[PDB]
């Protein structure tokens, strides 16, 4: 028996359709599972609305981290400006049957579900621009000095539509987030969206979220992850195919440089030597975003040829923004305020 029969063997609450909690919430059903717990849909009798309840796993390490999440959600939800409306709203939280429960405003499907719905053809450049703009505005809000919040797990599954037929989005899952100067983990971010500084074991700041955004925006237009590594070695090799070897000044300070690269007597770096015969990656920097995006050939896979809103000029602007978001140097990587001034967003 776990938690007196209330929990399964993975620390999760065994959800039961129709259950009424605290003479207030009427559980409709389980609507998602993840590493930190479950999200159920529930009707709130007192406020008379549908809400999403995240039931955190009944396990100390999960509980203690989720408490950092709550503090951050409360700090974001109360901070004064209107940019705060890109962040999901925590309505309240309580303990129930030894689980921490967070009650959220109801939202629709995530950006991954949207892509799946197009059969991974990708969404239009116009829709991509709308998501990009909203996300940069969310990132500008997190960068406001009082908050200085690093999300740490930006990816299509954590950006949700408010309404399934409309373009407005919100960011969820601050379960791994921290504030600048309160960093506690080293292996963070989903692998495909993971930044080079984290791969390399280096100190990291808010710039890691802009790296993830760049990866996300390409994926949303092409339908396909930009850097789809099966593990860390493979993830760094895939980044290198597109962007080249990272600059000497970063690798010279990187504790995990030698997991992926080796230093030559001249002071320059290469990828680590591999078995004779064993070709697997394109040579450094020869997989061009120019071709992935199909800038001059009708978009990703030619699928946008002779469509409105997908001109060569449009694509050149989009490509420039993306490369500025995928700068290897977290100190010169484009910051949210300047990204919003990019010609890609001109009216
Ligand atoms: N890294 C995944 C973060 C998600 C997540 O979707 N969290 C949400 C937070 C707040 C929220 N408010 N409304 C939501 N809507 C849905 O979950 C949903 C599901 C299916 C179809 C429409 C909407 C959601 C979802 C998640 C999913 C499953 C379990 C957890 Cl513990 C977290
Ligand atoms: Cl969440």
Annotated binding site: 31-39, 54, 104-107
Q: Are residues 218 and 318 in the same domain?
A: yes
C-alpha distance from residue 282 to each of 260, 324, 338, 344 (Å): 15, 22, 32, 29
**Do residues 41 and 28 make contact, with C-beta atoms less than 8 angstroms apart?**
yes
Helix, strand counts (H, E) of the chain = 11, 12
DSSP string, 124-166: -HHHHHHHHHHHHHHHHHHTSTTT-EE----SGGGEEESSTTS
Domain identity same for 135 and 71: no
Backbone angles phi, psi at 302, to 5 degrees: 70, 10
Does 222 share its domain with 347? yes
Shared-domain flag, residues 92 and 137: no
Same domain, 336 and 214: yes
Angstrom distance (rounded) from CA 37 to CA 128: 30
Domain count, the chain: 2
**Experimental technique of record:** X-ray
- In terms of domains, do 341 and 228 share one? yes
Q: How many CB atoms lie within 10 A of CB 220?
A: 24
**119 and 31, same domain (yes or no):** no
Structural domain of residue 259, as residue ranges?
81-87+107-347
Task: Could you list the beta-strand ranges (E) of 79-140.
Answer: 90-96, 99-105
* CATH number of the CATH domain containing 256: 1.10.510.10
Tell me, in angstroms, the distance from the centre of ligand 2 to residue 284's CA: 37
User: Cα–Cα distance between 212 and 192 in angstroms, integer?
Assistant: 8
Ligand nearest to the CA of 38: 1
Coil, strand or helix at 100: strand
Query: Distance (Å, rounded) from C-alpha 163 to C-alpha 331?
Result: 36
Residues comprising the chain, all counted: 347
Q: Give how far Cα 106 sits from Cα of 43, 44, 53, 208, 343, Å.
A: 10, 11, 9, 28, 34
Residues 119 and 205 in one domain: yes
Q: Is the CB of 54 under 6 A from ligand 1?
A: yes
Do 125 and 101 belong to one domain? no
* Shortest-distance ligand to the CA of residue 28: 1
Report, in angstroms and rounded to the nearest whole number, the Rg of the chain calculated over CA atoms: 22
Ligand 1 midpoint to CA 38 (Å): 8
Do 184 and 319 reside in the same domain of the chain? yes
- Helix H or strand E segment including 45: none
Q: Distance between CA 109 and CA 68 in Å, rounded?
A: 25
Q: Is there a contact between 106 and 51 (Cβ–Cβ < 8 Å)? A: yes
Q: Give the C-alpha distances (Å, rounded to integers) separating 47 from 94, 105, 202.
A: 16, 12, 46
Binding site membership of 88 for ligand 1 (Cβ less than 6 Å): yes
The Cα-based distances of 163 to 39, 106, 223, 270 in angstroms read 18, 10, 21, 48
Residues 187 and 68 in one domain: no
Q: How far apart are CA 66 and CA 140, in angstroms?
A: 24
CATH number of the domain residue 11 falls in: 3.30.200.20
Write a three-state SS string for 185-201: CCCCCCHHHCCHHHHCC
């Amino acid at each position: 028996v776990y938690n007196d029969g209330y929990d399964d063997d993975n620390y999760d609450y065994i959800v039961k359709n129709g259950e009424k909690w605290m003479d207030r919430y009427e559980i409709d059903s389980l609507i998602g599972k993840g590493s930190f717990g479950q999200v159920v849909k529930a009707y709130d009798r007192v406020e008379q609305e549908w809400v999403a309840i995240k039931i955190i796993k009944n396990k100390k390490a999960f509980l203690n981290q989720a408490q950092i999440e709550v503090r951050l959600l409360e700090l974001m939800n109360k901070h004064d400006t209107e940019m705060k409306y890109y962040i999901v709203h925590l309505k309240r939280h309580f303990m129930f049957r030894n689980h921490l429960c967070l009650v959220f405003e109801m939202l629709s499907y995530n950006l991954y579900d949207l892509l799946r719905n197009t059969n991974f053809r990708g969404v239009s450049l116009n829709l991509t621009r709308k998501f990009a703009q909203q996300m940069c505005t969310a990132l500008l809000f997190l960068a406001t000095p009082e908050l200085s919040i690093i999300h740490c797990d930006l990816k299509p599954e954590n950006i949700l539509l408010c309404n399934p037929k409309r373009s407005a989005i919100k960011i969820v899952d601050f379960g791994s987030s921290c504030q600048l100067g309160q960093r506690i983990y080293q292996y963070i971010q989903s692998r495909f969206y993971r930044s080079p500084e984290v791969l390399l074991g280096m100190p990291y700041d808010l710039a890691i979220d802009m790296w993830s955004l760049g990866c996300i925006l390409v994926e949303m237009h092409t339908g396909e992850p930009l850097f789809s590594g099966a593990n860390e070695v493979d993830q760094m090799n895939k980044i290198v195919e597109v962007l080249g070897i990272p600059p000497a000044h970063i690798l010279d300070q990187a504790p995990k440089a030698r997991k992926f690269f080796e230093k030559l007597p001249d002071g320059t770096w290469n990828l680590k030597k591999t078995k004779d015969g064993k070709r697997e990656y394109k040579p450094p920097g020869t997989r061009k975003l120019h071709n992935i995006l199909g800038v001059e050939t009708g978009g990703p896979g030619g699928r946008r040829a002779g469509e409105s809103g997908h001109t060569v000029a449009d694509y050149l602007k989009f490509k420039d923004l993306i490369l500025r978001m995928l700068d290897y140097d977290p100190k010169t990587r484009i910051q949210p305020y300047y990204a919003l001034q990019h010609s890609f967003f001109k009216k």
